[PDB]
Each structure stands twice: as C-alpha cells, then as structure tokens.
Amino acid sequence: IIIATKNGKVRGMQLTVFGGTVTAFLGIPYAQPPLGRLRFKKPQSLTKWSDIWNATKYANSCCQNIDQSFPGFHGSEMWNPNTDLSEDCLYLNVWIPAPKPKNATVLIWIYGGGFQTGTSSLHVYDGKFLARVERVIVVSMNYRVGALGFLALPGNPEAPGNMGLFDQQLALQWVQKNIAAFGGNPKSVTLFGESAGAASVSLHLLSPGSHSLFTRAILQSGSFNAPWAVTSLYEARNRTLNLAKLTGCSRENETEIIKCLRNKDPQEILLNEAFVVPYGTPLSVNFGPTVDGDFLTDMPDILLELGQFKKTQILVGVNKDEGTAFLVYGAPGFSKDNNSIITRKEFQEGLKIFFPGVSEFGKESILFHYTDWVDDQRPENYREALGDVVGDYNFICPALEFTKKFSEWGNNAFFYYFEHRSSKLPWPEWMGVMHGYEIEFVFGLPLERRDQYTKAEEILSRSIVKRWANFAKYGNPQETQNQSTSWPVFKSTEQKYLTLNTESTRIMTKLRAQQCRFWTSFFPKV
Template sequence: MTGQGVRLVLLSITLSVAVAQRTVIETTTGKVRGKVLNLYGRQVVAFLGIPYAEPPIGPLRFKPPQPAKNWTSVFDAFKYGNSCYQIKDTLFPNFTGSEAWNANTPLSEDCLKINVWMPNPPPADKTVMVWIYGGGFWYGTASLDYYDGKTIAAIENVVVVSMNYRVGSLGFLALGHPDAPGNMGLMDQNLALQWVQKNIAFFGGDPQKVTILGESAGSVSVGYHLLSMKSRSLFSRAIMQSGAPNCPWAFITNKEALRRGKAFARAVECPTTVPLAQTIECLRSKPADYIIANEWVTSDPIFRFPHVPVIDGTFITEDPKTSIRRGNFKKCSLLAGAVKDEGTFFLIYGAPGFSKQTESLISRSQFLEGVKMSVPETNSFGVDAIAFQYTDWLKENDGVSNRDALDDVVGDHNVICPLNDFAHAYASFGQAVYKYSFEQRASNLVWPKWMGTPHGYEIEFQFGLPLEPKRNYTRDEANFSRRMMRNWANFARTG
C-alpha cells in the first residue's frame, strides 16, 4: 500500500471515529448515544426515548412529575419510548386514516421520554423547535410517523425536540387534592421544557432560541405555557395550530372536574363517599388498562373530551379567558392558524347523517340536530341563532350545503373563533402575530374528498413527509412541504 493510501485509510478511520464520538452526548443526568441518519445528502443524529422524568407509577400515579434520576452507563437512545397509557381509536378497524394516529409503541405508565434530532456535525447555538402532539388530551404519542423530526432537522439545520406526556385520566384527573391536582400532562411538558433548557446546548441548540409548537391539544398546551408563569421563561416563541386554551373543549371548571373524577372512580369501583385520599389510593391500586378502559365518563357530543385542563392553583391560576382578556401571558411573537375544514374529522364520529362511506348529504333536520350537538353549552335561542347564521337560505334543503355548513359550525366554534380571539388579544397587547390558513389537501389522503383538508392534516407537510418517495406524494407536494418547513423554521429563527 502506498503512503498516500495509508494516509487515506487513516483519514477515513479518523473521520469514522469522529462521527461515532459525536453520537454520544453527556447530559445533566447521564450519557446518551444516538443513531446517525443519512438523508438528503446530510446527517442527523436521532436521540430517542431519553428519560426526562421518573416513571409516574405506584405512589407517583396522578402526581406532578419528578425529574429523572442520574444513570451511570451510556443510555442507548436508539428507539422511541413507550407511549403513555391511552384509549385507541377503533371506530374504523384497519383503516389507515384513523389508525395512523393511534399509539405505535407499547403502552405503559413508564412513558415520560424525550426525543432530540441534531444536525451532524453538531451545530452551535442553533434554533430549537419543540413539538407537542395533540389528541384531545386523551390520546397521542410523539412516536407517530407524522411527528418524525429528522427531515426538518436535516433540511432546515435546526434542533428538533418532542416528548411524551400523560393523557386521559392518568394525565388530567383533577380531584382538587395534592395527590391528584389535575394538569399533570401539562406539568410533564413543563418538565420536558426544563430539560431542554438544561441540556439542549449539549446537542448544539441555543436555550435562548426555543420555539414551542403544537397542533390541536398540543396547540392548546402551547397556549397554556404562554399563560402559565411556570413556563414562560422556558421558551422564546410559539406556534399554535388549530387550538387555544379558550376553546370550549380545552378547559373545565373545578366543580365539573370533580364531578367527572368521582364518576370515573365509581366506574372503576372506588369509593367516593370517603375522604379523597382514600379514593385516590383506591384508584392507584387499579391496573392502568382497567383505568383507561373506564375513563370516558362523559356523554358529551362532538369535540368534547372527558379529562382536560383545570385551574389547579399552581400551573393554571385563573380561567384562560380571563388571562387572555387581561393580557396575562408571555409577551412574544406568535404564529397561529388552522386548516380549511376543521370540523369534518369530528362529524364522522357521531353527527347525524355523517359517514366516511358516503357523501354525508344531510337533511335540514339532521343539520339542526347537528348544530345542537355541536354547541352543548348553548340554549335553544343560541342554537336557533347559529342555525340561522350558517344557513344558506337559497339552499335550505340542499344536502351539500347543510353538510358544509355544519363543518363550518363545528370548526368555527371549536377551533377557528377561539384561536382568532387568542391571536387578536396578543396583537392588541402589542405583540407580533402572524396568521395562516392551510388549504392544501394531500393527493394521497385516504379520507373521503368531501372532508376537504381535515383537522391535523397540515402536520405531514411541516415535518417533510412528502419528501420521502415511498409515501407517494407528488413533486409539487414535496416542494410545498419544503416551503412550509422553511416558513416554520424561519419563524422559529427570527420571529
């Protein structure tokens, strides 16, 4: 072998060792080893399933999270952690449209893990984007294909983070007691954001350039972090997609939370006429799968969920509408928006006359019944006023017109109007607010065409799924996805 050949081999070995060394990062709790990914002519190191909290099991069930303890050996962060215990959507068996949102890793209470995607070689002082998933606070997981951070990390040269947080009763049971205060899922997110502040510099991120973003309940969560004094110092900017804390499904009173909590306790055969500490002790003794199988204790209709945020006196200290009106929120730039057809995804889950197997051409009477179901807190006068406002009186009995009108009722009431109110409040207090409306329907979307661009279906574009040839998007969609990633990353970089 020539001297030049030896030098080339040594150089190759040196580079390989250097790359391997970069995959091990020392965090404040221990060393983690990531996996190198080669994509689009670049490298990203994925660190998946890093513990950021102690498992909330046994006496820690229903309690605020505790920081993870230190470990001594290198933690192999090669795969996603467990998904937090949750119900799965089984209404449409073997249908990818709904099942793609179901948890895709084993269910466990030992689920409080964080994921980081780092450009390689490691950057310095790079923008950080922290994703919070949605799911109505009753399901969701950071490991879904939709939320894979590798592509945007590679294309936009940013550090991407996501975390799992508790959902359902295990994350939001609120009994007005220190052992079950409510909002545990939000506190999980807060602890993950604290982890980011302490550790993200080790991954090349700048803790002073952290943007939090989320969709649906994830967007609501972003809003609560903007409102909560506990979170305001942990990030710099925010992106809210299809949700806000003032949405009618995103908050319940303490009285209603206690009513639901006791109904839930009775459903799992725990006493409710004894001191709350005894009720909670009984609830802790029940298997997690039994807990989640019995947690849906409400019969609320469209776009309502059983266990959601409350005023706990620590993380949330007042009604979110009051905070918004008073300007009691973090002052920062905000990007907010929604998709074109926010209501259709929820209409097929119980609105009269709606089905994914048909065109859902509903009658006038079905439209009126749907309006009543969609605004359960409104009296008959309010229902009549809403029906009047949304009726096309030249097409009063037209099935398409009635169907599309009910989509607008559900979308406006539950997403668009509250989010607009939140954004307008921000602007009125002098903050930079950017609004968007997302109307791109993916060419390979499996939901029926009448559903348009449904709730949640901007996410695949912002995370770059159309760039993957195996997913059968068009070239135009890939280019559109690149533009969306650039816009979101540019906002995170500069506001």
C-alpha cells in the same frame, strides 16, 4: 455517537436523510416513571444513571384509549399509538443535524389528541426532515393524557390536575439544562403543537413556570380558549368523583379516593373515563387542563383579556375544514364511505350530537346563522354547514380571538389559513382540508420524492418548512429568497392573514368574520 447529559450519557443513532445524516436520540427519560405511589402526581425529578442509556428506539406511549372506529383504515390508525402503552412513558426525542451544530434554534413539538390520546412517536411527527433541511434541533415528548394526566382534586397534591402539562414543562426544562450539549441554543426555543398540543402551547404562554423555558410559540389548529380546552373546577370534581364511583373508590377522605384509584389497573381507569360525563361528543375532553392554582392561576380567558402572558411573537393558523373530521364520529347521515348528503332534519339531529347540553333556542340560533344559503337547492348545504359549525366553533373562531387578544398587547403575530388538501389524504373528498393534515407538510414529509406526493406539494412543504424555521430562528416567518408572498403581521384592526396552498399564496383580511361574531359575541350568552 454519545452525548453526556446532566443525568448521564446517551447513545443515539445515525439516519440517512436526503443524501445526508441526522443524529437521532429516541426515548430519553426526562422524569421518574409516574408509577405506583407516583400515579396522578407532578413528574418527579429523575435520578442520575452511569451507563450509556441507549436512546435508539421510540419509548412507550402513555396509557390511552385507542380510536377503534375504523379498523384497518389508515386515516384513523395513523394517529393511534405505535409503541406499547404503559404508565412508564415520560420520555422525549431529539433530532440534531449532523455535523453537530454550534448554536442551533430548537423546535419543541407538543402533540394533540383531545388531551386523551397522542404520542410523540408517530410517523408524521418525525423531526429528521426539519433537522436535515433547516439545521434546527427538533425535540418532542410524551406527556400523560386522560385522567392519568389530568385528574383533578384541586389543592390536594395527590391529584392536583395538569400533570400532563407539568410533564411537558419538565421536558422544556430538560431542553433548557441539556440541549446545549447537543449543539442547541437554549436561548432560541420555539414551542409548536397542533390541536390540543396547540392549546398546550398557548397554556405555556400563560404559565409563569414556563415563561423562561422558551422563546417563541406556534399554534396549529388550537388555543386554550377553545371550548374543549379547559375543564371547569365543577366538571373536574364531578368527573373525578364519578370516576371514583365507577371504580368503587367512592370515599369521603378525598385522599383515600386517590389511594384507592391507585390500586386500579390503567385499563380499569381507561375504560371508565368515557362515562364520567353524562352526555359526550366527539370533541369531549373528559380530563383536561384545569385552573389548578399552580400551572394555571386564574381562568385563562381573564389572563388573556388582561394581558397576563409571556410577551413574544406567535404564529397561529387553522385549516379550511377543521370540523369535518368529527362529523364521521357520531353525526347522523355521515360516513367516510359516501358523500354524506344530509337533510335539514339530519343537520338538526347533528347539532343535538355536538351541542347536547344547549337550549332549544341555542340550537335554533346556530341553524339560523348557518342556513341562509345563496342557493337553497344545493344538496350539500347542510353537510357543509355542520362541518363549518364544528370547525368555526371549536377551532377557527377561538384561534382568531386568541390572536386578536394576544396582539393587542403589542407583540408580532402571524395568522395562516392552510387550505391545501393532501394528495395522499385517505379520508374522502367531501371532508376537505381536514383537521390535522397540515402537520405532515410542517414536518416536511412531502420533501421525500418517494413518499407519493405531487411536486406542487414538495414546494409548499419547502416554503412552510422555511417559514416555520425562520419564525423559530428570527421571529419572522418569511420566505425571503424565492420571491415569495410576504407574510404581514396580524394587527387587530386589519387582521391580515396568509393563505397557504399549492397555487397562489395570498394576503386576505378578516377570516370567517361574520361567523365568528356569532360564536364570539352571541353564542356565549346562551
């Protein structure tokens, strides 16, 4: 089964999915390897080939540091790369339904990982279920992360910043030029991504260069206005320079700094990325998107505020316990191996961990807003507050503010509150509905009866998969057949959102409303 693309032929493979067949093209190159003199530059266009490119296994993941905090723990290692790290990593994957479709809606996945980590080839990013069940084509790509993907000397094309975002953009282009040969409709392309992937999606809504490359957008636990999502030009240069010094590449001619940083090995650059910041947090994005003047022409919050984005529908949502995942990466008193009952003193020390460069009065004002308990004798109060602090501040409140702001310019938006905890979730129970653990439901892993999921979970996945597919195809995330709860548009007055769970799907109004006035109004002033 061979498909002719604009650059040459590619041979895929057949997969047996639910007594059916998906055709998989795994590891198709979509740019010149950003190697040698090409490191830190925008992706260069790919030179044609004449052979049959054998896109029959996932390609290299991009160079990155690996989570080594829990060796042998599936809860952390399910996210570590599962192919060789290599600078040669600009590849994508395509899952098409068999029999080859005529004009199928295309779903493009963008992974997260704090812009430092991630790869398309992970078990929970497998698009064969969606292809099999919903007759959509699924595409995913590897893009450069960390400094190799986001080092920034503004202006200077030898390190302009946002390389990783231009990698994604190049893959969106590849879909535009080639997906029709796979049976896909380039006029019906939904981007979707989680975490930093979701912030990437929202940044494609603002990038003029991407406005013609997709139709609709889905943002899972992420948006560009989250406090980790955009590196300032000050930080970007202090961090570029502190990488120079850390590698002995401190020079004056800022181009020779890059030429020097180019003869370093990826490892030399990888192991110094951690220390370019004086104080980090589990949520540190040392090298991320910047206002480069190319992909991003102004501070994105201004573009958002003043309506400078692609006018289309969005699906946005967040999980019930976004914060907890990061508490076990540094917060005192927290462990995945006990119930992490922390004290007032421990909660205070945890704030110093997550808000290190914040005034005493600023930390005092977080504590104040989060320690007015109904019952002051509940030992988990401080444990849950700190998770909620990280979750509200880093994910939930910015997603809500993005959705209010975006819908004020007239487009349909739909907001969800995923609040089911997987029966297979390998982290402990006090960590709740964790950051990242709707993804497997989105991709339909519970649709495999063999995969050790409950029947209730198969039904929730099936409803989510249909809602996502219906949003992609028709911009309306309804499940119209099984008397499902209808999903109302998020208007900026009523702010209705849909809860996703295995029990009762419900329509609620104005999520974390008291909490988000704090983060969105008061706290930016400190």
